[PDB]
Design a binder for this molecule. Sequence first.
Ligand SMILES: O=C(O)Cc1c[nH]c2ccc(Br)cc12
Length: 126
Amino acid sequence: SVKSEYAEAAAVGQEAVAVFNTMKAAFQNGDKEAVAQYLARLASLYTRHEELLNRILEKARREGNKEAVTLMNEFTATFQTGKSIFNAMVAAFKNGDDDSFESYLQALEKVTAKGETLADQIAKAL
Ligand SMILES: O=C(O)Cc1c[nH]c2ccc(Br)cc12
């Protein structure tokens, strides 16, 4: 069902949180070889999550589930805010700009934290 697909997409989101928090510890420790690998792992996790959410949104549209479509449009817009902040963070790591990396990291934590009430609303709506 779309609801079990949403549980699967959500688990992937939680994998990214786990990897992201491990990556923040590596960044703080200056272990850039680990950070590089966690940033590759996070990209693949975000590209997977993004595609799965798009399938959920498209299914909700085909089902005519107007409330789920509304909430999924709001969430997939915010997902792009997070994804943009992540990509800037990757660029800061490439450029050796730890100040920008720190900044983008906190922004990505706050963007994610904000979008959690809506993430849990979508589970109940589908
Ligand atoms: O997860 C998505 O739906 C979009 C996305 C694609 N790449 C990302 C990287 C970080 C964060 Br946060 C989000 C993304």
